Design a binder for this molecule. Structure first.
Ligand SMILES: NC(=O)c1ccc[n+]([C@@H]2O[C@H](COP(=O)([O-])OP(=O)(O)OC[C@H]3O[C@@H](n4cnc5c(N)ncnc54)[C@H](O)[C@@H]3O)[C@@H](O)[C@H]2O)c1
Ligand SMILES: [K+]
Ligand SMILES: [K+]
Ligand SMILES: [K+]
Ligand SMILES: [Mg+2]
Ligand SMILES: [Mg+2]
Ligand SMILES: [Mg+2]
Ligand SMILES: [Mg+2]
Ligand SMILES: [Mg+2]
Ligand SMILES: [Mg+2]
Ligand SMILES: [Mg+2]
Ligand SMILES: [Mg+2]
Ligand SMILES: [Mg+2]
Ligand SMILES: [Mg+2]
Ligand SMILES: [Mg+2]
Ligand SMILES: [Mg+2]
Ligand SMILES: [Mg+2]
Ligand SMILES: [Mg+2]
Ligand SMILES: [Mg+2]
Ligand SMILES: [Mg+2]
Ligand SMILES: [Mg+2]
Ligand SMILES: [Mg+2]
Lengths: 51, 58, 71, 171, 110
RNA sequence: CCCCACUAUGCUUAGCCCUAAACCUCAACAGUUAAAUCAACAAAACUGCUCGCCAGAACACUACGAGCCACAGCUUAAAACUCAAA
RNA sequence: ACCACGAUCAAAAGGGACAAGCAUCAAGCACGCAGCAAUGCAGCUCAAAACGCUUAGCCUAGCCACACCCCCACGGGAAACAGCAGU
């Protein structure tokens, strides 16, 4: 009974983990979207300077 | 519990967890991420600790 | 700080170097004798190894080198 | 090493670099640059060959590649400057730092550790268990102890045949 | 279930694989320093029978005691590889990881 | 000690030797300026963590052992006798 | 009493644990593994102190060790109070 209760506690914590990881991807995608934009401008500026 | 082997491992996985190995060969995984150290002690006491009755008798 | 502790060590070292210079021919004869006994003590250690292992003579083609000579 | 005609890493992706005068191509090649420009080309070749994301420079893989290029440049320097103690120190320290990196990569991502060793031609070695001088007395005695063991093994085999031969005669 | 071996279950780190079908395992235990009342690691070596020679230097293994020792120093057998060196599988999520970072996101399989 | 002369040596090359008051006598890393600021002097006082080292003076940068291209060398390094101080 | 498929007590054997000082004792020198065997592999211990020297009966409801010496005791040296009293 205690082992089954421990397995149910791990499953509960896993659903909270998945809910936490989804919110971190949406935030990671936003950051990764700005860095690519900034990195694209710095490349274009560097490419124009070399050209 | 002087005769129980306790071994620590650092930064091997993304999240912390405890694992107990029983004499029968069963393994008990305990996820401890987000829990406080007091909640961890109360958890392992409930699933694998001797109750106050068993200790009084001894 | 004064240099009285240095001065004690200074005289000790001066007298030691002078003693060694005065007896450098005796010490050279003593050092030679110690290196011989040192080589003999090393040869006995290797001989103890093959005798305790059951062999009657050194392994075929083995010659204990002189590991303490200047050469 | 890359050919001298290789363009610098900065002018390799500018539009129309293949239609400029030959003189302009020389002035933008490795032939007219210092050795450090050639090392940046070597580093780029290893990245595309090994790492999964050639643009990530902070990963443990990119660092091992970047340091491996520095190690090779120190070895080439010392081949000409054998009394340069300063760069001899930089070489030995860099080799130690790469071994520490490889140890950490082997423990965390073995699949990537194998591709690094193959790509860079690194033969990983485990450190010795003890650090102590092997002086003459020890080297000599250890050689004698190995000879004594080899001779005892031969005598133990010649004591099996004689016992086996005599046992067959009884029959 | 009985056994004449003292250490029934022990976890350790493989430190040697030069013997045939035998893995040399370093096992550490916490021992109380009586004067300082601080726990320090105390390590001991165990030879474990590895029939398939699947142990690699550096991986964490679980050893089970044999009914009787099979050799002078071989009293245990490899029961399970807990953490394969450089190829760890997070037990909490079941996904492969490299240190404290996932190699496959847990969100991949929901 | 002062004056003159001149040599080993200071230089180059190739090997050794492996020492210094090699001391800025102030170990590395991280942090603080508030509390009791703090024996004295020196270059204000502290916290966390780690490694190294120390336990009266002298004997002793010594003896012995061991290692070392070192053979009047270097490194490591005691004890007995002695004093009630240093 | 006798069998006790038992209990109690407790050898041999296997696993584990178990004094002090000296590291100026730093390497030990066969100390491992696999295999039914033949035989194969070259390993095993060690600065978290191996190997070695020196000191000491111990963890005291008591325990260990010894019992003239040669660790032992066929044999040998030799002729035995470390039982009580006694010299
Ligand atoms: N002796 C070793 O080769 C060795 C092996 C594993 C761990 N260690 C660790 O080294 C430290 C010093 O040990 P010690 O007090 O016995 O040495 P020590 O200074 O007394 O020297 C004894 C021997 O160990 C070597 N040694 C010294 N310092 C060492 C270090 N940091 N790492 C490796 N070898 C070293 C010496 O060269 C010498 O051969 C300790 O922390 C120890 O755990 C040493
Ligand atoms: K010094
Ligand atoms: K100074
Ligand atoms: K006896
Ligand atoms: Mg003055
Ligand atoms: Mg004097
Ligand atoms: Mg001259
Ligand atoms: Mg000049
Ligand atoms: Mg200076
Ligand atoms: Mg330091
Ligand atoms: Mg003193
Ligand atoms: Mg000196
Ligand atoms: Mg001296
Ligand atoms: Mg000497
Ligand atoms: Mg018994
Ligand atoms: Mg030491
Ligand atoms: Mg001595
Ligand atoms: Mg001992
Ligand atoms: Mg005695
Ligand atoms: Mg008597
Ligand atoms: Mg007897
Ligand atoms: Mg009597």
């Amino acid at each position: 009974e205690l082992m089954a209760w421990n397995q149910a506690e791990n499953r509960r914590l896993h659903e909270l983990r998945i809910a936490r990881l989804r919110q971190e991807e949406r935030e990671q995608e936003q950051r990764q979207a700005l860095e690519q934009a900034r990195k694209a401008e710095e490349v274009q500026a560097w490419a124009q300077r070399k050209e | 519990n002087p005769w129980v082997q306790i071994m620590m491992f650092k930064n091997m996985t993304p999240s912390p967890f405890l694992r107990f190995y029983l004499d029968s060969g069963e393994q008990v995984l305990v996820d401890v991420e987000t829990k406080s150290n007091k909640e961890i002690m109360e958890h392992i006491r409930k699933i694998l600790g001797k109750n106050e009755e068993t200790l009084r008798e001894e | 700080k004064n240099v009285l502790k240095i001065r004690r060590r200074k005289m000790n070292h001066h007298k030691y170097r002078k003693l060694v210079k005065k007896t450098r021919f005796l010490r050279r004869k003593v050092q030679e004798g110690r290196l011989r006994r040192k080589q003999i003590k090393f040869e006995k250690d290797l001989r103890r190894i093959w005798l305790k292992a059951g062999l009657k003579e050194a392994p075929e083609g083995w010659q204990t080198p002189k590991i303490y000579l200047r050469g | 090493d890359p050919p001298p005609s290789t363009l610098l890493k900065d002018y390799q992706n500018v539009p129309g670099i293949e239609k400029v005068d030959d003189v302009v191509k020389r002035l933008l090649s490795l032939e007219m640059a210092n050795k450090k420009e050639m090392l940046k080309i070597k580093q780029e070749q290893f990245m595309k060959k090994i790492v999964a994301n050639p643009e990530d420079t902070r990963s443990l893989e990119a660092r091992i590649i970047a340091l491996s290029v520095k190690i090779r440049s120190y070895e080439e320097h010392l081949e000409k400057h054998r009394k340069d103690k300063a760069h001899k120190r930089y070489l030995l320290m860099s080799i130690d730092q790469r071994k520490k990196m490889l140890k950490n990569l082997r423990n965390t991502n073995y699949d990537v550790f194998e591709k690094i060793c193959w790509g860079l031609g690194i033969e990983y070695t485990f450190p010795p268990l003890y650090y102590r001088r092997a002086h003459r007395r020890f080297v000599t005695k250890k050689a004698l102890c190995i000879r004594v063991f080899q001779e005892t093994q031969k005598l133990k085999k010649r004591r099996r045949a004689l016992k086996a031969a005599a046992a067959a005669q009884k029959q | 279930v009985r056994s004449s071996v003292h250490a029934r279950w022990i976890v350790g780190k493989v430190i040697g694989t030069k013997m045939q079908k035998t893995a040399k395992v370093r096992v550490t235990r916490l021992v109380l320093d009586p004067y300082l009342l601080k726990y320090f690691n105390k390590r001991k070596t165990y030879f474990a029978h590895d029939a398939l020679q699947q142990c690699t230097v550096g991986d964490i293994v679980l050893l089970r005691a044999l009914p009787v020792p099979r050799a002078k120093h071989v009293k245990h057998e490899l029961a399970e590889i807990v953490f394969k060196v450089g190829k760890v599988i997070d037990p909490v999520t079941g996904k492969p990881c490299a240190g404290t970072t996932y190699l496959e996101s847990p969100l991949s399989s929901e």
